[PDB]
Amino acid sequence: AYTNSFTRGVYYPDKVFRSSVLHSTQDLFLPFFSNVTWFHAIDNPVLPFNDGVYFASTEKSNIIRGWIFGTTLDSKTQSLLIVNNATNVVIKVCEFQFCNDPFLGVNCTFEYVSFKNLREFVFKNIDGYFKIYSKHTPINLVRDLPQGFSALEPLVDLPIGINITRFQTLLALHAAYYVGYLQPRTFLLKYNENGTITDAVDCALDP
Amino acid sequence: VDCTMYICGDSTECSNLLLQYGSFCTQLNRALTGIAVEQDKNTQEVFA
Amino acid sequence: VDCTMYICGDSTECSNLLLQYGSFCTQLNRALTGIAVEQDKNTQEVFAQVKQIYKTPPIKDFGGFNFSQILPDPSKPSKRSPIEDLLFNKVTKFNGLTVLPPLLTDEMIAQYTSALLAGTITSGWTFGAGPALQIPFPMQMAYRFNGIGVTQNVLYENQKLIANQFNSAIGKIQDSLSSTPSALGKLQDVVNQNAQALNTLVKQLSSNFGAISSVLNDILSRLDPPEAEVQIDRLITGRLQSLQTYVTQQLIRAAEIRASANLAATKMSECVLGQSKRVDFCGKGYHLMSFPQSAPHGVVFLHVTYVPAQEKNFT
Amino acid sequence: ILSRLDPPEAEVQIDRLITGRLQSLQTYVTQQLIRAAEIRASANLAATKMSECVLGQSKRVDFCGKGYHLMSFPQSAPHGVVFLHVTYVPAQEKNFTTAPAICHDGKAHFPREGVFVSNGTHWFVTQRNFYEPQIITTDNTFVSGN
Amino acid sequence: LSETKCTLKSFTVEKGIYQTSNFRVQPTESIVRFPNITNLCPFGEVFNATRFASVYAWNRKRISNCVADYSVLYNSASFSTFKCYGVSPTKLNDLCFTNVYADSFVIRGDEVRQIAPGQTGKIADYNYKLPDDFTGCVIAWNSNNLDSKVGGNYNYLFRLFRKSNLKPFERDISTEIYQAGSTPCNGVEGFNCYFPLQSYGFQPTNGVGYQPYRVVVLSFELLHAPATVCGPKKSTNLVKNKCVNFNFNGLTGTGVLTESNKKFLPFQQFGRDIADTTDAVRDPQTLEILDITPCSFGGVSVITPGTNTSNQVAVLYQGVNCTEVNVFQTRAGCLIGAEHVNNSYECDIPIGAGICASYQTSQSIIAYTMSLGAENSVAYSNNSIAIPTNFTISVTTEILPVSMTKTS
């Protein structure tokens, strides 16, 4: 549908170890309170990203996991399909077939790679690095977007080197998932004494 | 004073070259703001 | 601040290339030392105005007036009045930076102020000129009243009413000072400004100053001679301009502090140790008497004035 | 330096020379302005002192000397000025006994200028700043109430 | 005493407290420490690879995740292009690169002052894509008579015909035309489609430069990472609370490997308290968190009476605990060469925090709360007054500056 994306899709710019400040960073993120072209996932069409995002997402029980990259998205050129489980990692960033009813089924060389639960996924390509970020935390609501916050932690950090420009969706099969519309703004992260991103404000939203 | 405008003059190259120096420009704005507030303080204190 | 350590970070090459500039570091150290001495001069000049140490008699019989809210309290480990305690509780390193401790401590400041207060209460205004001569309060207050053109029997016919008004006013001012949080904005602003300036003067290391990076340690482990010189000349320029925005704005700021300290010294000598005839100098109204108190990096005065209140027509 | 040097290598040194001359000299012209501010403050203070203490007599406590002011005389010095202050200081004290009023014929009598003191058996009236006793009459007292 | 005579530029010295050259904690053990990591990297299978395939399909062998000898990475005189900016060669040895990656491409004669990941070429911008920034260093040995082809090489092909400007280090195999007008020719020849890539003419009868230059380049990355990866220097044992050798992962000094209880929250391990210096370290072999802190330093000040009365001198270290250098510890530092006394007097030479000092063959170098004046008390009673009987006349003196000198 179209909903306020609330405060989803934030992550750690690096996997290093900080302490107890109020910082400001400049990178590619997901908006706050966005007019997402949220087309559903189960009623299962494509999403937006705008200015600098992976396939941002939302998730209930590992429901909204896979998506497609490429440039023409027909395997005729740069084209990428991602099945997603994050348990038995036999990497398939390989080249597969896609659809405009975008859904996921069951070569790529270099194995040097990067609502009852919260597991939002990430698929970027920065300087060859094919970064991915996951999540794990349970909640209770079932209908729509929880009014909450969370930060996405990386899995690995290693490069592969395959180019991508455009996108479709996939659906890792054995309702609602929210994305946003951005331009390259800056964020103001906040921390606790235990080291978890607790708050953030978008510097280009209102006065 | 419009700091970056005065120094550069609508030049992207000048902007990217300037971003290597720091917070001189914020310092200048801060000092001028302090002066501006002090003036009105003086006038009020004398007359009211 | 330490010039060589701050600019070079223990690098023999950096020091060798810096040695061919001159005496900039010497001038900077001289200026900072001058400011450091000036501060202690200020505090001593304001507060040390008496030669002996007086103290109050053990028995408090002042004719009805109650001074318990300003005289020292023996229960506390540090002898401070309740107003002083409220004031003190109200208000809230490695890159060559140092901070030196002051010469006079809070205990000595408290003792000086207590001596002033006991002296004035016991003997009036005669302990500033020569020797101390005692006198009772109803007579001393009759003198003060006569000082502003009111015949002296008016005090003797209204002693109890005057005492009651005095005590009520003291209670009210204690409560009002306790209540509002924006009383000490001047002191808070001074402290905030100093800390902010120092923070930026350290974060200019987090600035670049011609450098491709900021933190000088890694840039110094990075750069060649003919480019390291290009960086350090701008780094000393910025450190001189910033510590000398402090030196400039703070020879300016020491000018402001010196003006304030001179004004405080004059106010003490003329309102505490005597009675003033200058209009609106020591308070609004007709001046009677003043009491001092201390506070972190400052001083506080409490004035006492006399105000007419009911009018009738005549011919 | 000017004899030995070459142009695009001497440009850096002349630029440095103006920067450092105007920089040492800029804390120093800022310091000419700063020291001028300080000297101006002192000069204004001296002018006020002359006008208020040599051309008159002042009542402000501890502005011209320590004690009670009487007179002043100026002198001269290289780049300066010197003042001499004449003051007044009490010397020797003695205890007494006091009282606010006296009720002779049921009326209350207050002193006009001075205090009531008693050597032990008799009552006199003296001025406050110097001990000279006088007999007590209706010349120097006024009546007010019962 | 000789030091302060030098500082004042005279022989006679008045009474007071003067300052001399400061004391830094010179390394109790020398200025040396760098982390456990000691790896390195080979180059053989990329320099002898069968295909350094064409500029649009360049080959890359994984050369990274190692302690690259940045001294070797700059001390190598075989490096022809060393405008490897951001960092600088002659100090490259003292550096700590978190990673040194492996990409590659082929240079030309005019670009040797332009060669890096980020370099000059439509070669780049269509077989590559990123800005033109300088960081990339090239191996070169004598290649005068090795391998070359008369007439022109149709693999290393100067792409004078490219639709846009120059941007290096990506990959794209489309040998596509100049869009100087509006013609997409889909990589074919023609008129107004001039074959997009011409040949430099790498001929063996020609000069040395034409004959082959297989180039191995190295990228550079710096991270605030868990301080496990940095340059070489001897790593001491985790001797807590003892000032030992440390150049900790790049941070020089001499000091302590104090085990840290700090959980050290999760993404600026080069602990970025606003000073941006490491405050905790973990290591793959020593998983424990190790705090970081430099040892002491502070000024040295000399107190002395007049030089015409005696030649004894006391020395005070500012803000230094005594054990870390008669010894007497005060709140202002450590004082050496003094006698503590209990009777209080006035102040002569102010030291700090309420302490003063003086000379005895009258008083010792006293240390306690000062004496503010002679105690007094006024006999106060509710029916007693005091009155003077005699007077005296006094004369004082005041001095004031009025003017200044006059220059131009």
Short mmCIF file of N, CA, C and O in Angstrom, two decimals, chain C residues 9-50:
data_model
loop_
_atom_site.label_atom_id
_atom_site.label_comp_id
_atom_site.label_asym_id
_atom_site.label_seq_id
_atom_site.Cartn_x
_atom_site.Cartn_y
_atom_site.Cartn_z
N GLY C 9 54.14 15.92 17.99
CA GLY C 9 53.82 14.59 18.48
C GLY C 9 55.00 13.65 18.54
O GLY C 9 54.90 12.50 18.11
N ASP C 10 56.13 14.13 19.07
CA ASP C 10 57.34 13.33 19.26
C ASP C 10 57.86 12.77 17.93
O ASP C 10 57.89 11.56 17.69
N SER C 11 58.27 13.69 17.06
CA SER C 11 58.88 13.34 15.78
C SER C 11 60.12 14.19 15.59
O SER C 11 60.03 15.42 15.48
N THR C 12 61.29 13.53 15.54
CA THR C 12 62.54 14.26 15.40
C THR C 12 62.58 15.04 14.10
O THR C 12 63.04 16.19 14.07
N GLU C 13 62.12 14.43 13.01
CA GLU C 13 62.07 15.13 11.73
C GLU C 13 61.17 16.36 11.81
O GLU C 13 61.54 17.44 11.35
N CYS C 14 59.98 16.21 12.40
CA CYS C 14 59.08 17.34 12.51
C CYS C 14 59.72 18.47 13.30
O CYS C 14 59.64 19.64 12.90
N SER C 15 60.38 18.14 14.41
CA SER C 15 61.04 19.18 15.19
C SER C 15 62.15 19.85 14.40
O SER C 15 62.32 21.07 14.46
N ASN C 16 62.92 19.06 13.64
CA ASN C 16 64.03 19.64 12.89
C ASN C 16 63.54 20.61 11.83
O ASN C 16 64.11 21.69 11.66
N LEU C 17 62.49 20.24 11.10
CA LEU C 17 61.90 21.18 10.14
C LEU C 17 61.25 22.37 10.83
O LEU C 17 61.17 23.45 10.24
N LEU C 18 60.77 22.21 12.07
CA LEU C 18 60.17 23.34 12.76
C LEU C 18 61.20 24.30 13.34
O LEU C 18 60.88 25.47 13.56
N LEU C 19 62.42 23.84 13.59
CA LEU C 19 63.41 24.66 14.28
C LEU C 19 63.83 25.88 13.48
O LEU C 19 64.41 26.81 14.05
N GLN C 20 63.54 25.92 12.18
CA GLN C 20 63.96 27.01 11.31
C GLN C 20 62.88 28.07 11.13
O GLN C 20 62.81 28.70 10.07
N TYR C 21 62.03 28.27 12.13
CA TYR C 21 61.00 29.30 12.06
C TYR C 21 61.27 30.46 13.00
O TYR C 21 61.29 31.61 12.56
N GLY C 22 61.49 30.20 14.27
CA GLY C 22 61.85 31.28 15.16
C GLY C 22 61.36 31.01 16.57
O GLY C 22 61.50 29.90 17.09
N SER C 23 60.77 32.04 17.17
CA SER C 23 60.42 32.05 18.59
C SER C 23 58.91 32.09 18.82
O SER C 23 58.47 32.52 19.90
N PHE C 24 58.13 31.64 17.84
CA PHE C 24 56.67 31.63 17.99
C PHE C 24 56.25 30.93 19.27
O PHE C 24 55.40 31.43 20.02
N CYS C 25 56.84 29.77 19.55
CA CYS C 25 56.46 29.02 20.74
C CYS C 25 56.77 29.82 22.00
O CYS C 25 55.98 29.82 22.96
N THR C 26 57.90 30.52 22.01
CA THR C 26 58.25 31.35 23.16
C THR C 26 57.22 32.44 23.39
O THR C 26 56.78 32.65 24.53
N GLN C 27 56.81 33.13 22.32
CA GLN C 27 55.81 34.19 22.51
C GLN C 27 54.49 33.62 23.01
O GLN C 27 53.85 34.21 23.89
N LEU C 28 54.06 32.48 22.46
CA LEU C 28 52.79 31.91 22.90
C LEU C 28 52.83 31.54 24.38
O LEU C 28 51.89 31.84 25.13
N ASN C 29 53.92 30.91 24.82
CA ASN C 29 54.03 30.55 26.23
C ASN C 29 54.04 31.79 27.11
O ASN C 29 53.41 31.81 28.18
N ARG C 30 54.73 32.85 26.68
CA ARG C 30 54.76 34.07 27.48
C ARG C 30 53.37 34.65 27.66
O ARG C 30 52.98 35.05 28.77
N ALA C 31 52.59 34.71 26.58
CA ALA C 31 51.24 35.27 26.67
C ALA C 31 50.36 34.46 27.62
O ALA C 31 49.66 35.02 28.49
N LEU C 32 50.40 33.13 27.49
CA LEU C 32 49.57 32.30 28.35
C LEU C 32 49.95 32.47 29.82
O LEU C 32 49.08 32.55 30.70
N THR C 33 51.25 32.56 30.10
CA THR C 33 51.69 32.75 31.48
C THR C 33 51.20 34.08 32.05
O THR C 33 50.78 34.15 33.22
N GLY C 34 51.24 35.14 31.24
CA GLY C 34 50.73 36.42 31.71
C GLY C 34 49.28 36.34 32.13
O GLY C 34 48.89 36.84 33.20
N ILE C 35 48.45 35.70 31.31
CA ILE C 35 47.04 35.55 31.67
C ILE C 35 46.89 34.78 32.97
O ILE C 35 46.09 35.15 33.86
N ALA C 36 47.65 33.70 33.11
CA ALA C 36 47.55 32.86 34.31
C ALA C 36 47.84 33.66 35.57
O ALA C 36 47.18 33.48 36.59
N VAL C 37 48.85 34.53 35.53
CA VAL C 37 49.14 35.35 36.72
C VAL C 37 48.02 36.35 36.98
O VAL C 37 47.62 36.59 38.14
N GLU C 38 47.51 36.97 35.92
CA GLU C 38 46.49 38.00 36.07
C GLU C 38 45.28 37.49 36.83
O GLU C 38 44.68 38.22 37.63
N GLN C 39 44.89 36.23 36.60
CA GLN C 39 43.68 35.71 37.25
C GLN C 39 43.79 35.74 38.78
O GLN C 39 42.88 36.22 39.48
N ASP C 40 44.90 35.22 39.31
CA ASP C 40 45.09 35.20 40.75
C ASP C 40 45.18 36.61 41.30
O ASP C 40 44.69 36.90 42.41
N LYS C 41 45.80 37.52 40.53
CA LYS C 41 45.82 38.91 40.96
C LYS C 41 44.40 39.43 41.17
O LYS C 41 44.10 40.07 42.19
N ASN C 42 43.50 39.11 40.24
CA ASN C 42 42.11 39.55 40.33
C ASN C 42 41.46 39.07 41.62
O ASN C 42 40.86 39.86 42.37
N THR C 43 41.53 37.76 41.88
CA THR C 43 40.82 37.22 43.04
C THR C 43 41.35 37.82 44.34
O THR C 43 40.57 38.21 45.23
N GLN C 44 42.68 37.91 44.46
CA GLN C 44 43.26 38.47 45.68
C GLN C 44 42.80 39.90 45.88
O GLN C 44 42.39 40.28 46.99
N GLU C 45 42.81 40.70 44.82
CA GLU C 45 42.43 42.11 44.94
C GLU C 45 40.99 42.26 45.39
O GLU C 45 40.68 43.11 46.23
N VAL C 46 40.08 41.45 44.83
CA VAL C 46 38.68 41.59 45.21
C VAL C 46 38.48 41.22 46.67
O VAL C 46 37.85 41.97 47.43
N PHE C 47 39.01 40.08 47.10
CA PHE C 47 38.54 39.53 48.36
C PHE C 47 39.37 39.95 49.57
O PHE C 47 38.80 40.14 50.65
N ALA C 48 40.69 40.12 49.45
CA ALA C 48 41.51 40.43 50.62
C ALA C 48 41.48 41.94 50.86
O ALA C 48 42.31 42.68 50.34
N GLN C 49 40.53 42.38 51.67
CA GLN C 49 40.38 43.79 52.00
C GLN C 49 40.48 44.05 53.50
O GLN C 49 40.34 45.20 53.92
N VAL C 50 40.72 43.02 54.30
CA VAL C 50 40.76 43.15 55.75
C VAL C 50 42.06 42.54 56.26
O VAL C 50 42.67 41.69 55.61
#
